[PDB]
Design a binder for this molecule. Structure first.
Ligand SMILES: NC(=O)c1ccc[n+]([C@@H]2O[C@H](COP(=O)([O-])OP(=O)(O)OC[C@H]3O[C@@H](n4cnc5c(N)ncnc54)[C@H](OP(=O)(O)O)[C@@H]3O)[C@@H](O)[C@H]2O)c1
Ligand SMILES: CCc1nc(N)nc(N)c1C#CCc1cc(-c2ccc(C(=O)O)cc2)ccc1OC
Length: 157
């Protein structure tokens, strides 16, 4: 399976100055749940902002940099390389990866952040005419998660 994994706000903002615009532990928890034991594919900028591979899953980084060789990370240099990765592969961002892959993935796990943040990077526009809502779950708010959010699983029609 090839899946997109993303959190975007009401205007499809996904990032600002190479960081997430919001603080949402429940979403990080869900990312961990979804991707542990599987594969994350991310663009070079997204990887550098995280700064190290995420534990207990395969980390794959797409870059044109022939010098890229980071411990605990597998490097690929072409979009086509993604299709050779075994198992459940999650496209983990950032904007360039989402734009390059949104027309190819099987399904999308999207956390809709119900706010309007300042952003400089975006998830591409999409229509629910193309995607079935397999599930939609309101995130629980608390002291540490204070922005309303909804977990979607969308499957291509
Ligand atoms: N909200 C979310 O769910 C989420 C998730 C992930 C990321 N983000 C955000 O997304 C933003 C970053 O997105 P971005 O578009 O600026 O960068 P990005 O997609 O993370 O990385 C871009 C880089 O990926 C490499 N790349 C992409 N396509 C390639 C291809 N076909 N062949 C070879 N290399 C390729 C290139 O690296 P080289 O220049 O090294 O060749 C390119 O410069 C950040 O703000 C981050 O916080 C948000
Ligand atoms: C966790 C935010 C997020 N949510 C969803 N639903 N899908 C995604 N693809 C990403 C993402 C991402 C990239 C990213 C992750 C992290 C990050 C932070 C904490 C944890 C963790 O505690 O597990 C994991 C990833 C940090 C920066 C960063 O880019 C700036």
């Amino acid at each position: 399976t090839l899946s997109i994994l993303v959190a975007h706000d009401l205007q499809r903002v996904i990032g600002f100055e190479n960081q997430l615009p919001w603080h949402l532990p429940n979403d990080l928890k869900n990312v961990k749940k979804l991707s542990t034991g599987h594969t994350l594919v991310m663009g070079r900028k997204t990887f550098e902002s995280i700064g190290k591979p995420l534990p207990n899953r395969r980390n794959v980084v797409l870059t044109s940099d022939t010098s890229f060789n980071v411990e605990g990370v597998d490097v690929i240099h072409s979009i086509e390389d993604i299709y050779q990765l075994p198992g459940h592969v999650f496209i983990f961002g950032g904007q360039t990866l989402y734009e390059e892959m949104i027309d190819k993935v099987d399904d999308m796990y999207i956390t809709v952040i119900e706010g309007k943040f300042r952003g400089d990077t975006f998830f591409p526009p999409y229509t629910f005419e193309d995607w079935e809502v397999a599930s939609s779950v309101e995130g629980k708010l608390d002291e540490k998660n204070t922005i309303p959010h909804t977990f979607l699983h969308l499957i291509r029609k």
